[PDB]
Design a protein around this nucleic acid. Sequence first.
RNA 1: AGAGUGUAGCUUAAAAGCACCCAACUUACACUUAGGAGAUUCAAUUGACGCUCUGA
Lengths: 108, 45, 77, 197
Amino acid sequence: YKTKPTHGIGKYKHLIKAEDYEYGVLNIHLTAYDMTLAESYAQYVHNLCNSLSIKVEESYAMPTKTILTTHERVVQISGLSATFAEIFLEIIQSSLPEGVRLSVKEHT
Amino acid sequence: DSSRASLTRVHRQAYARLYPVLLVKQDGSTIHIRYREPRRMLAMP
Amino acid sequence: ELTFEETERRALLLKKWSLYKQQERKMERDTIRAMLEAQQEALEELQLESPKLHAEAIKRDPNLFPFEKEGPHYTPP
Amino acid sequence: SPWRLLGALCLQRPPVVSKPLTPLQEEMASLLQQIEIERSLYLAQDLEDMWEQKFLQFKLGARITEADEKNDRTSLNRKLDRNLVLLVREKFGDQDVWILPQAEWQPGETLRGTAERTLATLSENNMEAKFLGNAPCGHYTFKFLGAKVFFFKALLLTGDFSQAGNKGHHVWVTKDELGDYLKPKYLAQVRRFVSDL
RNA sequence: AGAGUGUAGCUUAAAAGCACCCAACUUACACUUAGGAGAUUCAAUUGACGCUCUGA
């Protein structure tokens, strides 16, 4: 009740977000000869992201292009720090399995 | 550590046999690729 | 069809791989923490010994947007 | 107080060759292969013979160009399966220690500029390197008059390391020779921020 | 040389709970189900084996 000390004990919406130099939206493009290797690398990078507490938005894929085929994957990233970005991309560089094409391109 | 996610597999259910074919693009960089009909050697002219 | 012996071997394979990748992730995390704390103490020392350089230490190079670097191979050129 | 301004750079040559698979990984390779043939969904002999002979006729480039040298520490290709770190001997007026390439910086030059200068200061080459940020990777202070050394980080994209037989003592160290060449604690701890992998 | 000292990553937990990982469902994450490893540094509250800091 409004006049009682327990007023607002049940409100919940303020706990739900129903909506210092830092990067922008980052797209990591993974084009690989193997669907298997591309998917595995996407899983590994997503695990690193959610273990390091990086806001990951999308992990979709581009349509396949034929000219054999190369499978494409996307990883969205937002929220980096000075040392944190350095460690992140150096780890990505050092943990690239075999003949994979990374990217740090942005939206559009 | 460039092998932790190389020993990984397709997680779908509709697919045919895949084989480790060695591929070279233009300069002599042999890489395993999951390709049908094992050629064991590929080169792009 | 399959047999009990190969099933047991597969189970032990899963067990040993669990242990192996557990050690792998443990060492990866150890390196992560070690070099993160090294960089943090480096930044702290930089702030202590230079009040005008920590401000420009946090800025980001603008050349990383079109980043490019190829992965490993088997037969080098 | 009088402070000796000094920076440095722990150059990183990435592994051009992926590490060979362990027998554990090969056993898992067999298991994954056989499960694939289990879970798959549906004159060939002449084609197979032609393709296998095409495989045989061309010899694969050796993944290890290391077993033959045994002494080419100055060569950029000392190791391929692991990362390499530049390391050049130095001789001071009062000291003689195997020291990571250092450099002197002034307040008019920022740390990134110092690192870029060091890229070609001592190698006198056309090497192509890339920086990730202004964040250092190690700080070590040794005094006699204060002093400090900032080990930064950079990665090699390509390198035209001309006149490999330089008068210097550039020896590429991956992980192991670090302790052998750098005794004092202020220099043997570089492995903490060097990617051991 | 001196100080803080000390349960696996964390615990004003007393051999536990969170953590953590692969397998399946997921594009992927997440959830869920199946499994996995884990410690109270050594001797009688005390001394000495290991880590951090203060110096040379």
